[PDB]
């Protein structure tokens, strides 16, 4: 469950937030194949609840009615003819399963679900399943409310309600199977992976017994004995009884500390600074290298969402997001997932975005397709980081230096800082309040490197800026502190 299970070469993964099959079934073949991107996390794509109060928000999708490939995304069709189509170019996809519940106990009954299913939560009734109250912990918690009260109590955030989300009986083979069933419906349509959500409120060993139930990838497209890849979400900032390391033997886990830690940095909080990145990693107090799933943002932290602190940076602080983005996707450490997302009327009541709710760009709940504008940017409100340029030669920037150690590190003591991986390639940051002008020793062959933020190489020249790596390796460096991007990054394939 720790390989990726991505095309020879490819190193990331990026969220397709609230994205319709369709869409990503074009974006795969268009843009994420060339691109060298190695997959997508799709929001879940099992039938959920269809909230109209308010409006269709994002988060009713984390809150099932059956495991009919049915929703705003798309129907069975559809997601099946995404990841055919997405397999046949090498782009892989990843799915979210939100498998540690049902929907609120507070939900109405009827069919307001993204499929028409009908479904009673008050009654623990979901026939298209089908579950029924003997599938539920209603009985193995032990809080007065039934919800989860405190987190100092490992035992109820595992069995109790989370936040009144109905939870499934993960410790009987029946509940156990069921999941199994709709898993293996997607391993074989030609799912790669998943994002186990809500890991932390699942027993490590519930989860196990569900993933041995799983078949191999689907032997058309994946080699003997592929099993697919697992990054469990497990918000650990320590402090609980809970650890991230509990959950390694399933596969991945998801690393919060990394984008708090990276935002608080960037954002040069708390005295922290870009010098202080040389040690980057487990010498950060995070998890080892391989077994995390580095982000900067994350679908629920990028709107304070149960987020990590204020510290996340996201589009909004587009100047800083891409140079956090940057850093990571230059740093060995960790699987990286790019985040795109879809701007929504942010609204303010001081410190309070009372819009955080607000789902995709729509039209009467009808999710908007995802048109691409001329200069490869989007519209209809999709946000599109990964095709920003600076984070998308990024992507590739670590897929041509993947393998390579992380060397030739310097830092002028404050924020002016670089490194490189190997002699493959190097970056550099300047997010100080002056000019960062320096020779540096970038370990890479003599010649003219195009800078990748900057430009592009096309046809035998630069759109952009220039470095010139002479005999020794080393290159000069100039970057304002005023520069809209303040960072250059150069690699073996941005040679002339
Ligand atoms: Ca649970
Ligand atoms: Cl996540």
């Not at 891409?322 to 699987?335: C, I, Q, T, W």
């Amino acid at each position: 469950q720790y390989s990726s299970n991505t095309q020879q070469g490819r190193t990331s993964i990026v969220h397709l937030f609230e994205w319709r099959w369709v869409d990503i079934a074009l974006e795969c073949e268009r843009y994420l194949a060339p691109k060298g991107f190695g997959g997508v996390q799709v929001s879940p794509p099992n039938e959920n609840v269809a909230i109209h109060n308010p409006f269709r928000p994002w988060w009713e999708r984390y809150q099932p009615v059956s495991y009919k490939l049915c929703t705003r995304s798309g129907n069975e069709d559809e997601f099946r003819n995404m990841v055919t189509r997405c397999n046949n170019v090498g782009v892989r996809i990843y799915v979210d399963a939100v498998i540690n519940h049902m929907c609120g106990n507070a939900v109405s009954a009827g069919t307001s679900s993204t499929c028409g299913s009908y479904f009673n939560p008050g009654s623990r009734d979901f026939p298209a399943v089908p579950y029924s109250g003997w599938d539920f912990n209603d009985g193995k918690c032990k809080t007065g409310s039934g919800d989860i009260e405190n987190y100092n109590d490992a035992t109820q955030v595992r069995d109790c309600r989370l936040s009144g989300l109905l939870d499934l009986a993960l410790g009987k083979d029946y509940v156990r199977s069921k999941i199994a069933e709709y898993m293996n419906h997607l391993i074989d349509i030609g799912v790669a992976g998943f994002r186990i959500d809500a890991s932390k409120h699942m027993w490590p060993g519930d989860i196990k017994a569900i993933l041995d139930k799983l078949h191999n990838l689907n032997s058309n497209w994946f080699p003997e004995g592929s099993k697919p890849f697992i990054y469990q979400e497990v918000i650990d900032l320590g402090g609980e009884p809970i650890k991230s390391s509990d959950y390694f033997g399933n596969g991945r886990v998801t690393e919060f500390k990394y984008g708090a830690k990276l935002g608080t940095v960037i954002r040069k909080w708390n005295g922290e600074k870009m010098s202080y990145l040389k040690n980057w990693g487990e010498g950060w107090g995070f998890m080892p290298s391989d077994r995390a799933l580095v982000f900067v943002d994350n679908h629920d932290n990028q709107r304070g969402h149960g987020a990590g602190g204020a510290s996340i940076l996201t589009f909004w602080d587009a100047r800083l997001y891409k140079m956090a983005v940057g850093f990571m996707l230059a740093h060995p450490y960790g699987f990286t997932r790019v985040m795109s997302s879809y701007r929504w009327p942010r609204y303010f009541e001081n410190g309070k975005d009372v819009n955080d709710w607000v789902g995709p760009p729509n039209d009467n709940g009808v999710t908007k397709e995802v048109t691409i504008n001329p200069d490869t940017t989007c519209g209809n409100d999709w946000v599109c980081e990964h095709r920003w340029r600076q984070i998308r030669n990024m992507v590739n920037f670590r897929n041509v230096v993947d393998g390579q150690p992380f060397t030739n590190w310097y830092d002028n003591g404050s924020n002016q800082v670089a490194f490189g991986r190997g002699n493959r390639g190097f970056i550099v940051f300047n997010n100080d309040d002056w000019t960062f002008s320096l020779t540096l020793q970038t370990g890479l062959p003599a010649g003219t490197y195009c800078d990748v933020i900057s430009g592009d190489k096309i046809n035998g020249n630069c759109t952009g800026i220039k470095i010139y790596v002479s005999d020794d390796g080393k290159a000069h460096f100039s970057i304002s502190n005023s520069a809209e991007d303040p960072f250059i990054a150069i690699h073996a394939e941005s040679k002339l």
